[PDB]
């Protein structure tokens, strides 16, 4: 036919390679050493996340005979509900103020499409030509919705104000910054403002608010800084969660200049001012007050899990021995 | 009834006949590209590929890019396509030749030459010396006296010895001429076309009489004239009624039994795939009536009722599941069988260095087939035999000889070279003449025979009927007695260079139950010596009283009979003067028909070799190829059971059954007789043969078992169940004298009553039937024609290199396939299902878990590597190992890797290892992951952590699976995961990966998904080590 074929180690199969055997010697370790490895993290995220003080009020007001069941109703569009918690233990350092939204799919395909993602980022070109992706809030009646789609649409716009019930029952407001809650690559990179221009008003030139905001983007908040598609606010509510129960960070509560926690234990009451309505869809508006721990947050199903996996691998290596001395 | 009209062109032409080219070919210019009809209906994965490309097209109904599944649909359909263009266009280079090829017909007036495909029944032709048959013809004329012609039936049965075929008296004294065969006009009423080669019945009407006629008067598409200047014939069949082309079958399009049995394995997954999105489409009508409708952040206008709503992500939910079935693996497989392939043309053990012929894979669909084979149909000559038969040893007189005790053959000027004799004593012996009896011995040999001189370019050359004599003949030129040539009544000899030159008076003619043939020789000098040669059996009963030397010679017998050498006992004799004259008379009036002139010539025959003397006993020695013996008990051990299908003699085909120990003397042969009493004993009533082990059927024999209304067919199905059952049971089974279309009825009689996997191996055209109907084709290079080579999907010029072919490159490309589809089906199952339990968590608005991006490299970048490379260089044990553990091709015929158990095993695990990557992230996300201002629990990072542990897991479940740990596939294992976490941190996503909860719970989802499958398979090896883990223990 041809020629002699080239004595190489590829083409003849003869490639040096280590065979690995499953050896009852090498197998016991690697359950017994992760089952000896997750146990100590597991008892350290359990005990980690138990230490985090953690409150959540629910005052969506859906059942009865709680002091907010007024705004389900709101015939006067400004509705303001009070709802009183008790603080047992003070909250120490950094206290993040998040809020909740149960059984409201915010990973639904019909939803989590529906943005478009270039004009968020400053694309003049579909500033004033939303895509179809946003399509069923492209334009409002004639002219185009500058944050367009059903995300920037629906977005949570309650107020909620933590008050200190003191010693004299005079309520003492708590400082609570709107600024860094959220990352820094989406204020700086993912979202922009129009290019041009010193001033938010004409940039936003020929662009409706959304039918469900009450006020267009161009005075989400006063500081320059922090309006426009770089709203704090409106940036972490466009980053869509992954499942129907959720909650997203709205403001923060600095380390105090002195020495006592910045949360003292006691009576403490929220000042929410009812917008957001949820319970068509029964769902559940709920605030969430929570203090930085130096490894994340607290996730205890982490710690249960590696307490069970890291003691199934043990066992498991246990029968493995066992059997492996039967069978020696 | 076919009826043929000499030199008449219009005779039919007032469809029947067929002109006489021929076609091979299955496309022409046009209809190829209609050749997808055979690639997506026989392949449903085809079809279903193609839904998904119009499925995807729409806009109303879409969830991925539909130009990501014609870019790899082209590629699967594209290189079947273009690996059956190159295998048509060779089809079609080969047909142009054989239509091209030259010959002369009779046109009006004169011969002039005129190609085979304007041959046309009735037009006569003729053919020179070494020229092949254009048409099943009537032998008219030769060039030598009694219009008498010698063809070389090379094609019809793999054989190179001469056929004898006489033509009619009538034609032979009156056609030789060119002018009277213009003016011939002879009509013939044959029998219609059929594949049958030995028997033809018809007649010749002509000069107001009709001779019948026979297979001798008819010559052969598939032959080479021979010893001849020139012959005539008219033809009679032509281009497909030909009894060569009717003895052939289509070229079907081969495909594994894997690739069949995936077909019904991936039917499941269709009705899962189609189920599940039923299922979840139902879910989404519930969902959307309820909550979805009042749901106002859902509101998206076009109002779609609820059932409606559910009925388009029906859909939508198949392109998002639509991996379960991915259109990678039927792009993968390309790759891992061009590769498996590529490894038997580089194999340097089977490469043959003198001829320079390595390997060739000629067709790379079937290459882990080689792992499933239960029979081997093989050619005996030139597959187990190297078509040499030479003259070994002899027993000259008492003394045996040849026995290595103490050539150059320069002494006579006669010596070929051919004969390899090693013995000197023989040579000393015959120089010096100390003993006669040697002189006699081989000048016996140059006599008593029926050898053909060739004379051409000054070489002594040897052609002959019977394989036998020639070797006699070629072994007696070597010794110095050359056989220089022969007139009719007279035969010439050299003796040690001397010329000498006998008038031969009356030559015994040599039949099957004459058992030996004879030679009136008459001296110069005027002694008359007949020269007797045939079997022992006949010969020694005889002989006259005073031979001393007949137990002498009995015993080299035995000793040539331990060594399976063919042994033909050589007298002579010293008839008188007027002894002969009263028989010569007598003789002359046996010649004449009188009555039957069998009785007359046999009891003649009978009285003229009585009172002889004994020289001895040659040995021709029928040469094996190196390795052949070796090859059938290696592969014997591998429980595969190997048919010898060849056109010899029944004697020939037994003997080499012999030689290479497919018989033994424990075996109790069953012949063609015995079993007819079996088969019919059976059908009047696990077959006693599972005892006699043996099997020895004659065609002729296998006609009348195959027996080739309603009723009838019934006894057809059940007769031929019969036999095969009783075949496949014996040990050996040799079909002989079996015709090309023979040697694949019995392939498929094996293929259809016990679904066997069959491979055909074989040299020639005689093989080229059985090798384009078995599973897998094998051709032995080695024959000038190349169409075994041309027609077999593998090809190598020795026979021991089967061993390599089935317990090396088939047990491995098994190995290595079924690993490879259980992974990739694996990896997949797992990667798909993500998106159906996610489903139960937005609505089951079909909502993929991974990013856009992920879905479309997942089986690109991330997984594509691992396991090409696991299909590639995956060895359980060693080659040596494969070779010295034959038990081991037992792991691949019984099915054994791949099967419904094993596939959904896959899938189990696939299902459990998707819910593991999903639900305990969704632990971790449900609650809370390390969050603050700059924190994951989005989609994007909730898809991260799946994605991230979706890759380390498949990544690190290749790396259990792949046993043969190379550089390239530890590079490739751990680049994949490099390469993922490569592309994703900039060479938004590198957020949620730089957070220790983030990166704990990836390292929970990888570990969970990995130590069960530790546990299991080191308890499945420990309790259940299997053969390939015994020998790697005991490695
Ligand atoms: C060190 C780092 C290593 C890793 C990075 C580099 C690795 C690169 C090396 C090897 C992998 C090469 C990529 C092949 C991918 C398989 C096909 C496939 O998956 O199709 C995909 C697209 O694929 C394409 O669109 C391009 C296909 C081109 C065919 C190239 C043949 C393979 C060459 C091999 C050369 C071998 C060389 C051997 C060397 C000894 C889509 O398939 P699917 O998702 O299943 O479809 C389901 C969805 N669908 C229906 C909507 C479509
Ligand atoms: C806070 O956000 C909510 C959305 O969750 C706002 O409620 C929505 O308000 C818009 C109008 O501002 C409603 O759209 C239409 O209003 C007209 C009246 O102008 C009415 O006739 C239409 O039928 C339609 O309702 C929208 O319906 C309403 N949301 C729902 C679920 O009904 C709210 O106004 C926002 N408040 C502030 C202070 O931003
Ligand atoms: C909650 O606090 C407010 C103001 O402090 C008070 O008016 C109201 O009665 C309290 N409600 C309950 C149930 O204690
Ligand atoms: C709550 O906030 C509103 C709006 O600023 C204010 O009018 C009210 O006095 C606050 N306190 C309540 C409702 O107790
Ligand atoms: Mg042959």
């Given at each position: 036919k041809t020629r002699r074929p080239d004595n190489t180690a590829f083409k003849q199969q003869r490639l040096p390679a280590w065979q690995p055997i499953l050896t009852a010697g090498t197998v016991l370790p690697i359950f017994f050493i992760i089952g000896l490895i997750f146990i100590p993290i597991g008892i350290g995220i359990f005990v980690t996340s138990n230490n985090i003080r953690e409150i959540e009020i629910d005052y969506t007001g859906t059942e009865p005979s709680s002091p907010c069941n007024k705004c389900l109703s709101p015939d006067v569009t400004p509705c303001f509900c009070t709802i009183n918690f008790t603080l047992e233990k003070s909250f120490e350092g950094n206290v993040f103020m998040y809020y909740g939204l149960s059984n409201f799919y915010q990973n639904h395909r019909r939803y989590v499409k529906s943005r478009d993602d270039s004009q968020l980022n400053?694309?003049?070109?579909?500033?004033?030509?939303?895509?179809?992706?946003?399509?069923?809030?492209?334009?409002?009646?004639?002219?185009?919705?500058?944050?367009?789609?059903?995300?920037?649409?629906?977005?949570?716009?309650?107020?909620?104000?933590?008050?200190?019930?003191?010693?004299?029952?005079?309520?003492?407001?708590?400082?609570?910054?709107?600024?860094?809650?959220?990352?820094?690559?989406?204020?700086?990179?993912?979202?922009?403002?129009?290019?041009?221009?010193?001033?938010?008003?004409?940039?936003?030139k020929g662009t409706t608010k959304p039918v469900n905001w009450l006020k267009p983007v161009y005075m989400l908040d006063s500081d320059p800084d922090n309006n426009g598609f770089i709203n704090e606010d409106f940036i972490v509510w466009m980053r869509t969660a992954a499942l129907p129960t959720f909650r997203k960070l709205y403001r923060l509560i600095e380390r105090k200049s002195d020495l006592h926690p910045t949360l003292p234990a006691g009576r403490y009451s929220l000042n929410v001012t009812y917008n957001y309505p949820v319970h068509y869809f029964d769902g559940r508006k709920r605030m969430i007050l929570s203090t930085i721990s130096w490894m994340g947050g607290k996730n205890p199903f982490l710690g249960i899990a590696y307490i069970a996996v890291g003691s199934i691998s043990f066992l498991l290596g246990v029968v493995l021995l066992v059997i492996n001395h039967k069978y020696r | 009834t076919w009826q043929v009209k000499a030199n008449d062109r219009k005779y039919h032409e007032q469809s029947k006949y067929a002109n006489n080219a021929i076609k091979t070919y299955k496309y022409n210019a046009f209809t190829f590209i209609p050749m997808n009809l055979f690639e997506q209906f026989k392949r449903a994965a085809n079809l279903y590929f193609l839904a998904l490309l119009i499925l995807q097209a729409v806009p109303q109904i879409s969830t991925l890019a539909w130009y990501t599944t014609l870019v790899p649909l082209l590629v699967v359909l594209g290189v079947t396509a273009i690996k059956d263009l190159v295998d048509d266009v060779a089809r079609h280079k080969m047909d142009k030749e054989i239509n091209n090829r030259t010959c002369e017909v009779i046109k009006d007036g004169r011969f002039k030459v005129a190609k085979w495909k304007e041959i046309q029944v009735g037009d006569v032709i003729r053919l020179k010396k070494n020229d092949f048959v254009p048409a099943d013809i009537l032998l008219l004329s030769s060039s030598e006296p009694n219009s008498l012609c010698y063809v070389e039936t090379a094609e019809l049965d793999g054989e190179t010895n001469l056929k004898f075929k006489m033509s009619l008296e009538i034609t032979d004294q009156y056609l030789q001429r060119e002018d009277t065969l213009a003016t011939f006009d002879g009509f013939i009423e044959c029998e219609e076309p059929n594949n049958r080669l030995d028997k033809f019945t018809g007649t010749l009407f002509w000069r107001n009489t009709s001779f019948p006629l026979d297979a001798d008067k008819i010559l052969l598409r598939g032959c080479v004239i021979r010893n001849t200047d020139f012959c005539h014939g008219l033809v009679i069949f032509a281009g497909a009624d030909t009894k060569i082309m009717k003895n052939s079958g289509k070229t079907r399009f081969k495909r594994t039994k894997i690739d069949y049995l995936m077909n019904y394995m991936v039917y499941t997954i269709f009705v899962v795939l189609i189920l599940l999105s039923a299922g979840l489409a139902i879910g989404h009508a519930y969902w959307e009536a309820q909550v979805g409708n009042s749901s106002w952040y859902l509101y998206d206008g076009e109002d779609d009722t609820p059932s409606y709503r559910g009925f388009l992500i029906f859909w939508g939910y198949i392109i998002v599941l639509n991996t379960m079935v991915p259109i990678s693996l039927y792009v993968s497989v390309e790759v891992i069988r061009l590769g498996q392939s590529h490894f038997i043309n580089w194999d340097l053990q089977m490469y043959y260095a003198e001829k320079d012929t390595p390997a060739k894979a000629r067709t790379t669909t079937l290459n882990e087939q080689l792992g499933?084979?239960?029979?081997?149909?093989?050619?005996?000559?030139?597959?187990?035999?190297?078509?040499?038969?030479?003259?070994?040893?002899?027993?000259?007189?008492?003394?045996?000889?040849?026995?290595?005790?103490?050539?150059?053959?320069?002494?006579?000027?006669?010596?070929?070279?051919?004969?390899?004799?090693?013995?000197?004593?023989?040579?000393?012996?015959?120089?010096?003449?100390?003993?006669?009896?040697?002189?006699?011995?081989?000048?016996?040999?140059?006599?008593?025979?029926?050898?053909?001189?060739?004379?051409?370019?000054?070489?002594?050359?040897y052609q002959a009927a019977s394989p036998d004599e020639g070797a006699l003949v070629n072994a007696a030129r070597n010794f110095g007695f050359a056989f220089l040539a022969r007139t009719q009544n007279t035969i010439t000899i050299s003796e040690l260079g001397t010329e000498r030159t006998y008038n031969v008076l009356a030559i015994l003619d040599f039949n099957s139950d004459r058992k030996?043939?004879?030679?009136?020789?008459?001296?110069?000098?005027?002694?008359?010596?007949?020269?007797?040669?045939?079997?022992?059996?006949?010969?020694?009963?005889?002989?006259?009283?005073?031979?001393?030397?007949?137990?002498?010679?009995?015993?080299?017998?035995?000793?040539?009979?331990?060594?399976?050498?063919?042994?033909?006992?050589?007298?002579?004799?010293?008839?008188?003067?007027?002894?002969?004259?009263?028989?010569?008379?007598?003789?002359?009036?046996?010649?004449?028909?009188?009555?039957?002139?069998?009785?007359?010539?046999?009891?003649?025959?009978?009285?003229?070799?009585?009172?002889?003397?004994?020289?001895?006993?040659?040995?021709?020695?029928?040469?094996?190829?190196?390795?052949?013996?070796?090859?059938?008990?290696?592969?014997?051990?591998?429980?595969?059971?190997?048919?010898?299908?060849?056109?010899?003699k029944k004697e020939t085909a037994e003997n080499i059954g012999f030689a290479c120990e497919l018989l033994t003397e424990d075996t109790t042969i069953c012949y063609g007789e015995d079993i007819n009493s079996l088969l019919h004993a059976r059908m009047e009533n696990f077959f006693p043969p599972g005892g006699n082990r043996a099997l020895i059927i004659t065609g002729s024999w296998l006609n009348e078992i195959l027996l080739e209304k309603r009723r009838l067919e019934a006894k057809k199905e059940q007769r031929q169940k019969n036999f095969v059952?009783?075949?496949?049971?014996?040990?050996?089974?040799?079909?002989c004298r079996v015709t090309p279309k023979q040697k694949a009825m019995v392939v498929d009689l094996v293929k259809r009553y016990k679904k066997?996997?069959?491979?055909?191996?074989?040299?020639?055209?005689?093989?080229?039937?059985?090798?384009?109907?078995?599973?897998?084709?094998?051709?032995?290079?080695?024959?000038?024609?190349?169409?075994?080579?041309?027609?077999?999907?593998?090809?190598?010029?020795?026979?021991?290199?089967?061993?390599?072919?089935?317990?090396?490159?088939?047990?491995w490309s098994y190995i290595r396939m079924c690993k490879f589809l259980r992974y990739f089906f694996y990896k997949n199952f797992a990667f798909t299902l993500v998106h159906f339990w996610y489903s139960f968590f937005n609505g089951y608005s079909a909502q993929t878990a991974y990013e856009d991006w992920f879905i479309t490299l997942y089986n690109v970048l991330y997984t594509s590597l691992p396991v090409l490379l696991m299909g590639l260089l995956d060895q359980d044990v060693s080659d040596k190992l494969s070779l010295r553990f034959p038990g081991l091709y037992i792991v691949g015929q019984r099915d054994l890797l791949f099967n419904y158990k094993?596939?959904?095993?896959?899938?189990?695990?696939?299902?459990?290892?998707?819910?593991?990557?999903?639900?305990?992230?969704?632990?971790?996300?449900?609650?809370?992951?390390?969050?603050?201002?700059?924190?994951?629990?989005?989609?994007?990072?909730?898809?991260?952590?799946?994605?991230?542990?979706?890759?380390?897991?498949?990544?690190?479940?290749?790396?259990?699976?792949?046993?043969?740990?190379?550089?390239?596939?530890?590079?490739?294992?751990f680049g994949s995961i490099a390469?993922?976490?490569?592309?994703?941190?900039?060479?938004?996503?590198?957020?949620?990966?730089?957070?220790?909860?983030?990166?704990?719970?990836?390292?929970?989802?990888?570990?969970?998904?990995?130590?069960?499958?530790?546990?299991?398979?080191?308890?499945?090896?420990?309790?259940?080590?299997?053969?390939?883990?015994?020998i790697q223990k005991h490695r």
């Open positions: 400053g694309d003049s070109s579909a500033l004033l030509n939303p895509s179809k992706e946003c399509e069923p809030y492209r334009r409002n009646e004639d002219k185009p919705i500058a944050p367009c789609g059903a995300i920037a649409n629906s977005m949570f716009n309650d107020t909620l104000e933590l008050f200190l019930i003191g010693n004299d029952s005079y309520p003492i407001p708590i400082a609570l910054k709107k600024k860094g809650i959220a990352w820094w690559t989406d204020k700086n990179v993912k979202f922009r403002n129009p290019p041009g221009g010193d001033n938010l008003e004409e940039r936003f | 499933q084979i239960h029979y081997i149909f093989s050619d005996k000559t030139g597959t187990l035999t190297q078509n040499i038969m030479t003259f070994k040893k002899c027993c000259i007189n008492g003394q045996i000889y040849g026995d290595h005790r103490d050539v150059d053959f320069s002494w006579n000027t006669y010596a070929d070279g051919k004969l390899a004799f090693y013995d000197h004593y023989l040579i000393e012996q015959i120089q010096s003449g100390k003993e006669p009896e040697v002189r006699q011995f081989f000048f016996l040999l140059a006599v008593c025979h029926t050898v053909m001189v060739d004379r051409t370019d000054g070489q002594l050359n030996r043939m004879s030679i009136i020789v008459r001296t110069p000098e005027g002694n008359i010596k007949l020269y007797c040669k045939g079997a022992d059996t006949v010969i020694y009963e005889r002989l006259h009283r005073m031979n001393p030397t007949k137990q002498e010679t009995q015993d080299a017998l035995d000793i040539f009979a331990n060594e399976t050498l063919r042994t033909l006992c050589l007298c002579y004799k010293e008839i008188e003067e007027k002894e002969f004259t009263e028989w010569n008379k007598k003789f002359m009036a046996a010649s004449v028909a009188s009555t039957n002139r069998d009785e007359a010539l046999d009891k003649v025959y009978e009285e003229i070799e009585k009172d002889l003397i004994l020289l001895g006993a040659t040995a021709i020695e029928d040469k094996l190829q190196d390795g052949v013996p070796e090859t059938i008990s290696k592969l014997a051990k591998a429980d595969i059971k190997i048919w010898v299908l060849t056109g010899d059952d009783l075949a496949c049971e014996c040990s050996a089974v040799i079909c066997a996997i069959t491979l055909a191996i074989g040299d020639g055209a005689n093989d080229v039937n059985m090798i384009k109907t078995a599973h897998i084709g094998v051709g032995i290079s080695g024959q000038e024609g190349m169409q075994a080579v041309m027609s077999s999907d593998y090809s190598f010029a020795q026979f021991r290199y089967l061993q390599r072919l089935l317990l090396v490159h088939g047990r094993r596939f959904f095993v896959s899938l189990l695990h696939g299902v459990l290892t998707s819910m593991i990557l999903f639900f305990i992230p969704l632990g971790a996300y449900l609650q809370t992951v390390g969050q603050d201002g700059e924190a994951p629990s989005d989609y994007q990072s909730f898809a991260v952590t799946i994605a991230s542990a979706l890759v380390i897991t498949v990544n690190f479940q290749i790396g259990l699976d792949t046993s043969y740990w190379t550089f390239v596939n530890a590079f490739s294992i390469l993922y976490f490569g592309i994703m941190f900039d060479f938004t996503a590198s957020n949620a990966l730089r957070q220790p909860y983030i990166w704990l719970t990836i390292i929970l989802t990888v570990a969970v998904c990995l130590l069960p499958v530790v546990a299991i398979r080191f308890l499945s090896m420990t309790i259940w080590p299997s053969e390939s883990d015994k």
